Design a protein around this ligand. Structure first.
Ligand SMILES: N=c1c2ncn3c2ncn1[C@@H]1O[C@H](COP(=O)(O)OP(=O)(O)OC[C@H]2O[C@@H]3[C@H](O)[C@H]2O)[C@@H](O)[C@H]1O
Length: 252
């Protein structure tokens, strides 16, 4: 029809089959995740949002699933990223130098998906889901990503890397999940340094974005939590990926 309940697009078509298949698949590639029963994962997942008003979703609603998806990612090789999805993934895919959220079982199950149910019903709503901004922040998708992103920051140790999109005017954005969940949930007992990689978008190597006002902010935020801060520009990310694929491949 012409109206729709919510302002957001509705559940990714064939959601259950997709999440379940992604489960099987991930438990096939990654051997320390073969104890996982995928149908169980699915039931945890479903039970987090099915028959709940999709604006009255909590982190607790997700804890059964967070328990089934329990995973150790080497705590010193974590790559956080904000608003620069594709470089972060093309990077970790070369030789697994680092792990992003989407290299975890849970992050790989939800990545690029949308889901919600209805209060009155056990039906998945394929027609519309709440919008973070126009409707409510406590919706199935937003709440999932916040909880998993928190846990993932809290898992991290030693030198933690963040990739940031330097093409944005707010390179460090206090209102992103990085700036408002992860930055606050890095554990200062365990995290020695946050190292920012500011990924330039063009004219190759523009200004030094490590002097960006928002970057001086991130820095003082992190310094006052007693974690050291370090920043590096990445001028040509294409060249940076070719260097990672072939170190000492002429410039690298
Ligand atoms: N993998 C996704 C993803 N795929 C699609 N989407 C994802 N959101 C977050 N995640 C991950 O959580 C992190 C934090 O989410 P956020 O920066 O708020 O994405 P935003 O720039 O706020 O984009 C959020 C929206 O983009 C969709 C969701 O439908 C909805 O969460 C992201 O860095 C990313 O690792």
């Amino acid at each position: 029809r012409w109206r729709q309940t919510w302002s957001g697009p509705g559940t990714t078509k064939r959601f259950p089959e997709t999440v379940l298949a992604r489960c099987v698949k991930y438990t096939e590639i990654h051997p320390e995740m073969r104890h996982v029963d995928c149908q169980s994962v699915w039931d945890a997942f479903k039970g987090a949002f099915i028959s709940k008003h999709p604006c009255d979703i909590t982190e607790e609603d997700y804890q059964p699933l967070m328990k089934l998806g329990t995973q150790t990612v080497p705590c010193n090789k974590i790559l956080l990223w904000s608003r620069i999805k594709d470089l972060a993934h093309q990077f970790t895919q070369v030789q697994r130098d680092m792990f992003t959220l989407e290299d975890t079982l849970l992050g790989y199950l939800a990545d690029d998906l949308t889901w919600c149910g209805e209060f009155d019903t056990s039906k998945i709503n394929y027609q519309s889901c709440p919008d973070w901004r126009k409707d409510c922040s406590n919706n199935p998708v937003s709440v999932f990503w916040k909880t998993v992103s928190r846990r993932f920051a809290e898992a991290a140790c030693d030198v933690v890397h963040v990739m940031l999109d330097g093409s944005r005017s707010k390179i460090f954005d206090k209102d992103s999940t990085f700036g408002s969940v992860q930055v606050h949930n890095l554990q200062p007992e365990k995290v020695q340094t946050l190292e920012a990689w500011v990924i330039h978008g063009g004219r190759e190597d523009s200004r030094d974005l490590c002097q960006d006002p928002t970057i001086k902010e991130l820095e003082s935020i992190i310094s006052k939590r007693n974690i050291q801060f370090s920043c590096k520009n990445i001028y040509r990310p294409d060249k940076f990926l070719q260097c990672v694929k072939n170190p000492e491949d002429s410039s690298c």
